[PDB]
Amino acid sequence: TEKPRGYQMSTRLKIVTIHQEPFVYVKPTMSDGTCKEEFTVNGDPVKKVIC
């Protein structure tokens, strides 16, 4: 009886980037997949994502 209208508005998105410093860096990881946690000049955690 219901109108099966609309659309499943997705919440998992695909993002495309390119290698361009100083905007986006590219670094190879460690030997166990997760790459090296580092710190800034202030000791703040440099947030990275697994590209």
- Cα separation, 47 vs 38, whole angstroms: 9
Cα angle: 45, vertex 48, 51; to 5 degrees? 170
- Return the SS3 of 5: coil
How close are the terminal C-alpha atoms of the chain, in Å? 45
CA torsion sign for 23, 24, 27, 33 is positive
Structure obtained using: cryo-EM
Instruction: Please answer whether residues 19 and 26 qualify as being in contact, where contact means their C-beta atoms are separated by less than 8 angstroms.
Output: yes
